[PDB]
Design a protein around this motif. Structure first.
Motif, PDB file in Angstrom:
ATOM      1  N   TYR A 121       5.515  -8.942 -15.473  1.00  0.00           N
ATOM      2  CA  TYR A 121       4.484  -9.585 -14.654  1.00  0.00           C
ATOM      3  C   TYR A 121       4.514  -9.114 -13.205  1.00  0.00           C
ATOM      4  N   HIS A 122       5.644  -8.565 -12.754  1.00  0.00           N
ATOM      5  CA  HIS A 122       5.889  -8.412 -11.321  1.00  0.00           C
ATOM      6  C   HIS A 122       4.791  -7.603 -10.633  1.00  0.00           C
ATOM      7  N   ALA A 123       4.370  -6.493 -11.239  1.00  0.00           N
ATOM      8  CA  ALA A 123       3.384  -5.626 -10.575  1.00  0.00           C
ATOM      9  C   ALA A 123       2.064  -6.351 -10.349  1.00  0.00           C
ATOM     10  N   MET A 124       1.647  -7.151 -11.322  1.00  0.00           N
ATOM     11  CA  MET A 124       0.398  -7.879 -11.178  1.00  0.00           C
ATOM     12  C   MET A 124       0.530  -9.019 -10.166  1.00  0.00           C
ATOM     13  N   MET A 125       1.712  -9.660 -10.080  1.00  0.00           N
ATOM     14  CA  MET A 125       1.954 -10.627  -9.001  1.00  0.00           C
ATOM     15  C   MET A 125       1.813  -9.951  -7.642  1.00  0.00           C
ATOM     16  N   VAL A 126       2.374  -8.744  -7.501  1.00  0.00           N
ATOM     17  CA  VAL A 126       2.232  -8.008  -6.236  1.00  0.00           C
ATOM     18  C   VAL A 126       0.767  -7.714  -5.935  1.00  0.00           C
ATOM     19  N   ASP A 127      -0.010  -7.335  -6.959  1.00  0.00           N
ATOM     20  CA  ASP A 127      -1.444  -7.064  -6.777  1.00  0.00           C
ATOM     21  C   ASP A 127      -2.132  -8.223  -6.064  1.00  0.00           C
ATOM     22  N   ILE A 128      -1.886  -9.450  -6.524  1.00  0.00           N
ATOM     23  CA  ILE A 128      -2.540 -10.592  -5.895  1.00  0.00           C
ATOM     24  C   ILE A 128      -1.899 -10.898  -4.553  1.00  0.00           C
ATOM     25  N   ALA A 129      -0.567 -10.772  -4.443  1.00  0.00           N
ATOM     26  CA  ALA A 129       0.084 -11.062  -3.166  1.00  0.00           C
ATOM     27  C   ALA A 129      -0.423 -10.126  -2.074  1.00  0.00           C
ATOM     28  N   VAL A 130      -0.601  -8.853  -2.409  1.00  0.00           N
ATOM     29  CA  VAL A 130      -1.149  -7.914  -1.430  1.00  0.00           C
ATOM     30  C   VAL A 130      -2.548  -8.331  -0.990  1.00  0.00           C
ATOM     31  N   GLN A 131      -3.375  -8.842  -1.913  1.00  0.00           N
ATOM     32  CA  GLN A 131      -4.694  -9.326  -1.501  1.00  0.00           C
ATOM     33  C   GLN A 131      -4.575 -10.472  -0.501  1.00  0.00           C
ATOM     34  N   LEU A 132      -3.637 -11.411  -0.714  1.00  0.00           N
ATOM     35  CA  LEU A 132      -3.440 -12.471   0.287  1.00  0.00           C
ATOM     36  C   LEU A 132      -3.027 -11.882   1.633  1.00  0.00           C
ATOM     37  N   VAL A 133      -2.040 -10.975   1.638  1.00  0.00           N
ATOM     38  CA  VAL A 133      -1.565 -10.435   2.908  1.00  0.00           C
ATOM     39  C   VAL A 133      -2.697  -9.691   3.620  1.00  0.00           C
ATOM     40  N   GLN A 134      -3.485  -8.911   2.869  1.00  0.00           N
ATOM     41  CA  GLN A 134      -4.624  -8.210   3.481  1.00  0.00           C
ATOM     42  C   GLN A 134      -5.654  -9.175   4.061  1.00  0.00           C
ATOM     43  N   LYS A 135      -5.946 -10.273   3.364  1.00  0.00           N
ATOM     44  CA  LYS A 135      -6.887 -11.249   3.918  1.00  0.00           C
ATOM     45  C   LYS A 135      -6.439 -11.725   5.301  1.00  0.00           C
ATOM     46  N   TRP A 136      -5.162 -12.107   5.421  1.00  0.00           N
ATOM     47  CA  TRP A 136      -4.663 -12.642   6.684  1.00  0.00           C
ATOM     48  C   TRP A 136      -4.553 -11.554   7.741  1.00  0.00           C
ATOM     49  N   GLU A 137      -4.196 -10.332   7.340  1.00  0.00           N
ATOM     50  CA  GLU A 137      -4.169  -9.225   8.296  1.00  0.00           C
ATOM     51  C   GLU A 137      -5.554  -8.905   8.844  1.00  0.00           C
ATOM     52  N   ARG A 138      -6.605  -9.236   8.107  1.00  0.00           N
ATOM     53  CA  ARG A 138      -7.961  -8.889   8.516  1.00  0.00           C
ATOM     54  C   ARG A 138      -8.647  -9.998   9.290  1.00  0.00           C
ATOM     55  N   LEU A 139      -7.983 -11.135   9.498  1.00  0.00           N
ATOM     56  CA  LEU A 139      -8.578 -12.189  10.302  1.00  0.00           C
ATOM     57  C   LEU A 139      -8.688 -11.752  11.762  1.00  0.00           C
ATOM     58  N   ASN A 140      -9.706 -12.267  12.435  1.00  0.00           N
ATOM     59  CA  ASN A 140      -9.822 -12.024  13.865  1.00  0.00           C
ATOM     60  C   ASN A 140      -8.903 -12.960  14.636  1.00  0.00           C
TER      61      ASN A 140
END
Ligand code: HEM
Ligand SMILES: N#Cc1cc([N+](=O)[O-])ccc1O
Ligand code: NI
Length: 451
Positions: free
Chosen positions: A111-130
């Motif tokens: 499961y680990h790789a797919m957990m990372v897939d979603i975790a990276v989406q969360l980190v990218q969302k917060w990195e892209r906030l103004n």
């Protein structure tokens, strides 16, 4: 046996006429002690709060899992899935044997790789906030955990980070759960004033089942080899009976795992981040671990296993606010509890986990303090003192999945951002059978570490 205040006819039932019944029961436990009787018209249960009594309640030779009135109500959509089955129903042990290998070490590594897939989406969302933008914490944790169980379990993308409003499955799930919790305080449940609560309930169940229908269809029409939770539901055979699950049970398992597999983990992540921002020295210690261990662009499985202090943070969050806060038991035979309380066969018990976790004879006097160091040596905790995942053969099948996901995500959060209790949030715990902070917002300043 102590008993809280009564209301004539209604006995104790009006005490549940609140939006926060578990927190109400915790306050009663503070007043009355380790055990108290709770009566409603036609039903009686005993709420336990001390490790002294709960260690006996967890003796599986004497007590089995009970379906509380709450669980019987949600069995309207959970059916005889794993969570709402009696231990003695044939489909419980069948599904238990078939699905347990979906939670083995080998499965978790898968499961680990797919957990990372979603975790990276969360980190990218917060990195892209103004600058000056807030993070709605339980909302984003629910985006993360729903997407994770969808992908890892079912190779299905909810794509929750592509929506500003909650996914329609979530909206119906919350209303269905909240309807079940609200139905516990109805003195006369068939009163015609609730006949559109009942309409809304059935519509929400249809929303959930339609989604289940799509997940099954996508798997049917998929030209890709999956070996995930759904593969085992559809193909696995029980070693004892030699039988696979039938179609009706499969549908119940899918709903069960979609809900169970994300909601409490979203609560845990939200409580953990709350306690971290309220306890800056603990946050610093966890962030130092994340920086020391997470040396690669994305975490490896082994690195997540090495996030010891992050794991301690999560267990200490589950100590104070276990997100599935009570479980129910019944007496298999006449027996005596604690040398003091005779029980008849069939008598029901409720384990009030947040109160168990505040037992001063176990944890010391500072039980309200957030101190992850209490979990430095897990072996020091006495048997049945720490029970956020339930008990025995009916304990949570997903415990390792939840903790791995939460440790991975919290580790990456701590690596990548500094957090601010921007609004000096006052803890407000929403109850929908499970517990979650409501209205909790932070700001996150990027440490600008590339992914
Ligand atoms: C922090 C997150 C979680 C918490 C606190 C939690 C808590 C619990 C508790 C207390 C029970 C026992 C319920 C009872 O005795 O009536 C349980 C059972 C269960 N949980 Fe979880 N859970 C979590 C995550 C998960 C996940 C991630 C999954 C699936 C991937 C899951 C699936 C289940 C199932 C299917 C059962 C029923 C097991 C059986 O009786 O055979 N849970 N959980
Ligand atoms: N776990 C877990 C779990 C969570 C929920 N829930 O969050 O509603 C319901 C049933 C469960 O077995
Ligand atoms: Ni397999």
């Amino acid at each position: 046996m102590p008993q809280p205040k009564t209301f004539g006819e209604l006995k104790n039932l009006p005490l549940l006429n609140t939006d926060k019944p578990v927190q109400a029961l915790m306050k009663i436990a503070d007043e009355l002690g380790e055990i108290f009787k709770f009566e409603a018209p036609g039903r009686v249960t005993r709420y336990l709060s001390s490790q002294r009594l709960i260690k006996e309640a967890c003796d599986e030779s004497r007590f089995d899992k009970n379906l509380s009135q709450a669980l019987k109500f949600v069995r309207d959509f959970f059916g005889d899935g794993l969570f709402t089955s009696w231990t003695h129903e044939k489909n419980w042990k069948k599904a238990h044997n078939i699905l347990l290998p979906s939670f083995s070490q080998q499965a978790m590594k898968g499961y680990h790789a797919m957990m990372v897939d979603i975790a990276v989406q969360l980190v990218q969302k917060w990195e892209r906030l103004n600058a000056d933008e807030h993070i709605e914490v339980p909302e984003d944790m629910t985006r993360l955990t729903l997407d994770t169980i969808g992908l890892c379990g079912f190779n299905y993308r909810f794509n929750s980070f592509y929506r500003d409003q909650p996914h329609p499955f979530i909206t119906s799930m919350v209303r269905a759960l909240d309807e079940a919790m609200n139905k516990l305080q109805r003195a006369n449940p068939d009163d015609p004033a609730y006949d559109e609560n009942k309409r809304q309930f059935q519509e929400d169940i249809k929303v959930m089942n339609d989604l289940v229908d799509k997940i099954i269809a996508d798997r049917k029409a998929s030209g890709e080899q999956s070996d995930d939770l759904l593969t085992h539901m559809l193909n696995g055979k029980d070693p004892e009976t030699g039988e696979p699950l039938d179609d009706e049970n499969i549908r119940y398992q899918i709903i069960t795992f979609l809900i169970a597999g994300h909601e409490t983990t979203s609560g845990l992540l939200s409580f953990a981040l709350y306690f971290l921002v309220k306890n800056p020295h603990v946050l610093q210690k966890a962030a130092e671990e994340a920086a020391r261990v997470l040396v690669d662009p994305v975490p490896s499985y082994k690195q997540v296993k090495q996030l010891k202090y992050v794991g301690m943070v999560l267990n200490e969050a589950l100590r104070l606010w276990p997100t599935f806060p009570a479980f129910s038991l019944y007496a298999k035979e006449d027996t005596v509890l604690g040398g003091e309380y005779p029980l008849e066969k069939g008598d029901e018990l409720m384990v009030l986990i947040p109160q168990l976790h505040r037992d001063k004879t176990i944890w010391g006097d500072d039980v309200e303090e957030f101190r992850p160091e209490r979990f430095e040596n897990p072996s020091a905790i006495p048997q049945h003192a720490f029970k956020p995942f339930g008990n025995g053969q009916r304990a949570c099948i997903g415990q390792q999945f939840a903790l791995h996901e939460a440790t991975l995500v919290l580790g990456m959060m701590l690596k990548h951002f500094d957090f601010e209790d921007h609004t000096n949030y006052e803890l407000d715990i929403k109850e929908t059978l499970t517990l979650k902070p409501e209205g909790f917002v932070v700001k996150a300043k990027s440490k600008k570490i590339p992914l």
